[PDB]
């Protein structure tokens, strides 16, 4: 049963390849899990080395011919768009679930019964999912609990020293953008900017917006406190005639007169701008005037604006002009003829942080900015790439906490309890089927991979901690009270995940159990592999 230029793997031989295909992808990603995970290198082929612990960036940068890992990577990409966290968690659940299933495949169990046992246990897992979850209050004074959610998304990908740096940055970034009510939150209002020349531990949060081009003149004020803002669209630099012409000077001084006469049209608008500062808080302290003007400005106007102590910006990004319009409040002024003091906005202290090569102007201390900025600092591109992965996944982690009022404790508390749940429930219930008991038991034993590999990457004996946690759960059930138990990676014993502050999102775990079950199910449904047309 063959034709030329074809390959076929049939009669359970495809199952041994597909399960091994999952064991190969699992062992690679088994190294990095939780805060004890590992760092990997990704070569794009252009010579740029990128170090990241995020499974989202890993699966996209690597090319795998194995079709089993392709479906895992494609399904994890859907999980990365929905959950945004726990990419490795999904892979570890799929691989181990196929390993426990492959042992029953060698026993002669049909894969449909194995997949049916996973779907029945998944429906019972969703019932325990709603029972085990903890309902968190909607109060926005919960920052203490947000400090626990932050450490969950931070400690994983960082040395834990950048955690204390990024903890006040991420937590203040979400609550500043989020108004107090139930409405929504916008992650686009938080800008992510990267800079060099300074250590990553000095990364700071920017309440306002950050920009590159500053006022160029030695005498311009560096620090201006509580100044009015002007958004100006008109070019203050030298202009030329729209039609071809020339300047013919009879005398040497006439050459400067013709140049001053052409700039007089721009100088006429320049006089109307400086009269606005003389009209409003010219000599008044704690008040100033700033020119964010979008188009270019010649050095002659920069010298005039410096004598007035006016900060003058030129060649500003078009997107930032609309963003600074909402942050500062001042409307965009196309023509100076319509310039009025009521159009001017208001901002707080504007101070230029000037390194050797570059100058940084800060818009911060705004009345109603409604836009934040996270400025990522690093000496090399390694710290800039690793921090950007922690910021993007850190903001989306807290974002799912305000959108979903339900939260679940982490540290394997959900996986160990549910595995013990299906073990004791299926024996008491016995309402599924006799042959389904294999699929249910394999699914319950496969979910132990996360708490086993989490402490395995920590170095502690997994058999010891899983025994102490199981004994503590049995002692908790004998005392007849609710006790949440989780693994402690630093000490190696058990602990309380609610006290330790380790929490897992509800939407992440809801799509992880349902997603990993659907991934491994479709892989067991493949009896034969076929390669044709090649």
């Amino acid at each position: 049963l063959l034709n030329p230029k074809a390959e076929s793997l049939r009669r359970d031989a495809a199952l041994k390849v597909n399960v091994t295909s999952a064991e190969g992808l699992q062992s690679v990603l088994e190294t990095n899990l939780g805060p004890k995970g590992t760092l990997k290198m990704l070569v794009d082929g252009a010579g740029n080395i990128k170090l990241t612990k995020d499974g989202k960036v890993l699966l996209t940068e690597m090319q795998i011919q194995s079709p089993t890992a392709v479906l895992i990577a494609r399904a994890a990409a859907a999980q990365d768009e929905i959950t945004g966290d726990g990419t490795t968690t999904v892979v570890c659940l799929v691989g181990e679930l196929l390993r426990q299933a492959h042992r029953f495949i060698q026993e002669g169990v049909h894969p449909r019964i194995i997949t049916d046992g996973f779907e029945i246990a998944r429906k019972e897992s969703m019932k325990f999912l709603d029972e085990f979850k903890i309902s968190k209050t909607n109060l926005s004074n919960d920052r203490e609990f947000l400090l626990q959610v932050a450490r969950s998304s931070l400690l994983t990908k960082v040395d834990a020293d950048l955690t204390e740096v990024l903890t006040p940055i991420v937590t203040d970034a979400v609550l500043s953008v989020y108004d107090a009510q139930a409405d929504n939150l916008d992650l686009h209002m938080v800008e992510i900017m990267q800079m060099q020349h300074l250590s990553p531990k000095d990364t700071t949060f920017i309440k306002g917006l950050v920009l590159d081009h500053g006022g160029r003149h030695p005498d311009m004020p560096t620090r201006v406190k509580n100044a009015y803002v002007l958004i100006l669209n008109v070019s203050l630099e030298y202009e030329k005639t729209e039609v071809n012409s020339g300047f013919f000077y009879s005398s040497a001084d006439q050459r400067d007169k013709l140049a001053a006469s052409e700039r007089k049209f721009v100088d006429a608008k320049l006089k109307k701008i400086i009269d606005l500062k003389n009209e409003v808080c010219g000599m008044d302290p704690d008040k100033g005037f700033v020119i964010i003007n979008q188009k270019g400005i010649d050095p002659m106007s920069l010298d005039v604006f410096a004598k007035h102590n006016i900060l003058a910006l030129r060649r500003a990004k078009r997107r930032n002009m609309e963003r600074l319009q909402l942050v500062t409040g001042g409307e965009a002024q196309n023509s100076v003829e319509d310039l009025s003091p009521q159009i001017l906005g208001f901002s707080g202290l504007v101070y230029q942080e000037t390194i050797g090569e570059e100058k940084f102007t800060y818009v911060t201390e705004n009345t109603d900015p409604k836009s934040c900025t996270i400025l990522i600092k690093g000496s090399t591109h390694y710290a800039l790439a690793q921090t950007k992965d922690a910021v993007r996944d850190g903001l989306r982690a807290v974002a799912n906490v305000l959108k979903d009022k339900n939260i679940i404790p982490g540290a394997g508390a959900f996986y160990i309890a549910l595995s013990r749940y299906l073990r004791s429930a299926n024996m008491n219930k016995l309402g599924a089927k006799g042959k389904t008991k294999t699929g249910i038991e394999a699914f319950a034993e496969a979910l132990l991979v996360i708490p086993k590999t989490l402490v395995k990457n920590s170095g502690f004996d997994p058999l010891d901690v899983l025994a102490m946690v199981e004994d503590e759960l049995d002692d908790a059930q004998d005392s007849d009270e609710t006790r949440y138990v989780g693994v402690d990676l630093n000490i190696g014993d058990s602990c309380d995940p609610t006290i330790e502050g380790i929490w897992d999102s509800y939407r992440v775990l809801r799509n992880a159990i349902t997603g990993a079950t659907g991934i491994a199910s479709n892989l067991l449904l493949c009896d034969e592999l076929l390669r044709a047309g090649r």
Binding site: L1, L2, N3, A6, E7, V70, R112, D527, A532
Partner: protein
């Protein structure tokens, strides 16, 4: 180059056996998934039998004949694509030892397959049970078989109404000893052609009898509906005509300039006057309409439609009877606009439409579908064709046959009984047909996980002593009666299944050599 002797008979059976062997796991609602490896880095997880074999490149030409066999089955029945291919491939596999090891001449086997085909059609008619085709509640539970496990399961009641009301419009059910019996002819292809309108709800989807047009009315104030309409169809636009020869009008005299400008407006009115001679209430043209022709026909008391496709007017001519006449002076009085109920221009989804809908069924209809998106309309579309294909097989024969391996085993038992009473050398290949009929239910057992040998012999014992309605359950996988949970499918599916299977099997057995040349 050349395959002679018995080598060609081996390659013809092996090629058909390889195509069937791939989709053996594709049979049943519990059927497994097939992972295909493309020459590129892609993969295909689809379990649909037609989408798999289409992505599988084949070499031997007999495998291409099996691909064309499934293409014919897809035009007849909407489901059961793998059922016919596996059955046709197993017949050649069961006749392989008798053709070679037993040294039976192939023509003897081919003549034996024709006798087994006639006996099989008689057994299917005996095991089939009648059902009321006029019961609306019964037809919904039938079509529902091709409905569930799809997104349309929630609207299934509305999906059956759109399926029944569509086929009941185009069907002509007649019979007698005088002019003959059409045998309940139903054409889904040409007459039931559908138009999908985005937006709205499935409840708002209606089956209109007529031709639907997306173009609006040229003037806002006009007669919305006419009692007894008169329709004129013409391809030519409405505007000032010009001569085909050289036309030059030289104006010298002063008072003759305004006269020619009036004649140009009279020529436009003259072309409209030739249309109004038959007193039409509706004017449909393929090209645009000039503003002058709009005003001349507005005062004439008729409806005007412009920018209508030519393929649409051809479908209008069949439900109406108005023949397209190019020149307005050649307009016949024989073609009329009769049997057109309403001209209603009512806006649907912020887009002005035109309704030709009538109160009668001129053997055609236009289905108007509403959905939440174009992907939903495409899902409703293909599901509506499969919904009507099941209702078609029920209207093309009153009897239903049990599925899930019940009919497959019911035939194999009767073939084994007729084998003992059939003398001659054709008896041995005749028993191979009954062994091929047992492959379909055993395939459902292999996909279920149960013991294929144990459950098959026990299932055969149920047909021998008890009734034939005891099949294999899809969800469970244990021997049960099909009367409990009806899997029941129409007989027409089983008719063409074994019919084309023998025709495709005998076609490959007749070829004793394969040569290459142009």
């Amino acid at each position: 180059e050349r395959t002679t002797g018995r080598q060609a008979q081996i390659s013809n059976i092996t090629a058909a056996k390889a195509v069937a062997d791939v989709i053996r796991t594709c049979l049943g609602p519990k059927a497994m998934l097939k992972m295909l490896l493309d020459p590129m880095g892609g993969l295909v997880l689809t379990n649909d039998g037609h989408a798999i074999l289409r992505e599988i490149d084949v070499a031997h030409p007999a495998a291409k004949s099996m691909l064309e066999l499934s293409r014919t089955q897809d035009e007849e029945v909407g489901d059961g694509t793998t059922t016919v291919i596996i059955l046709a491939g197993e017949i050649l596999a069961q006749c392989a030892p008798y053709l070679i090891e037993k040294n039976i001449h192939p023509v003897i086997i081919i003549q034996a397959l024709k006798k087994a085909l006639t006996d099989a059609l008689e057994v299917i008619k005996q095991v089939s049970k009648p059902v009321d085709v006029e019961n609306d509640a019964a037809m919904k539970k039938l079509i529902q078989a091709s409905i569930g496990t799809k997104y349309v399961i929630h609207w299934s009641e509305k999906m059956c109404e759109l399926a029944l009301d569509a086929v009941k419009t185009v069907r002509k059910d007649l019979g007698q000893t005088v002019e003959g019996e059409p045998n309940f002819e139903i054409d889904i292809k040409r007459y039931v052609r559908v138009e999908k309108i985005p937006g709205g709800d499935v409840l708002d989807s209606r089956v209109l009898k007529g031709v639907l047009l997306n173009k609006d009315v040229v003037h806002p104030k006009m007669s919305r509906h006419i009692e007894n309409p008169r329709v004129v169809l013409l391809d030519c636009p409405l505007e000032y005509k010009k001569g085909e020869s050289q036309t030059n009008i030289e104006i010298e005299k002063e008072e003759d300039w305004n006269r020619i400008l009036q004649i140009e407006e009279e020529q436009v009115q003259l072309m409209c006057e030739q249309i109004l001679a038959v007193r039409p209430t509706l004017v449909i043209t393929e090209k645009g309409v000039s503003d002058l022709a709009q005003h001349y026909l507005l005062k004439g008391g008729c409806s005007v439609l412009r920018r209508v496709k030519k393929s649409d007017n051809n479908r209008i001519a069949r439900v109406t009877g108005a023949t397209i006449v190019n020149r307005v002076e050649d307009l016949k009085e024989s073609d009329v606009g009769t049997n057109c109920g309403l001209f209603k221009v009512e806006m649907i989804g912020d887009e002005y439409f035109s309704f030709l809908d009538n109160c009668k069924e001129p053997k055609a209809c236009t289905i108007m579908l509403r959905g939440g998106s174009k992907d939903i309309l495409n899902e409703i579309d293909r599901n509506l064709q499969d919904a009507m294909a099941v209702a078609r097989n029920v209207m093309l024969s009153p009897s239903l046959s049990p599925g899930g391996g019940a009919t497959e085993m019911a035939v194999s038992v009767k073939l084994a009984e007729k084998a003992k009473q059939l003398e001659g050398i054709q008896q041995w290949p005749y028993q191979a047909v009954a062994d091929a009929m047992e492959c379909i239910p055993r395939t459902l057992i292999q996909n279920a996980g149960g013991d294929p040998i144990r459950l098959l012999s026990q299932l055969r014992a149920k047909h021998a002593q008890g009734n034939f309605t005891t099949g294999i359950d899809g969800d469970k996988g244990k021997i049960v009666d099909m009367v409990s949970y009806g899997i029941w499918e129409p007989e027409v599916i089983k008719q063409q299944s074994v019919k084309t299977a023998i025709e495709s099997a005998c076609l490959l057995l007749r070829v004793d050599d394969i040569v290459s040349g142009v």
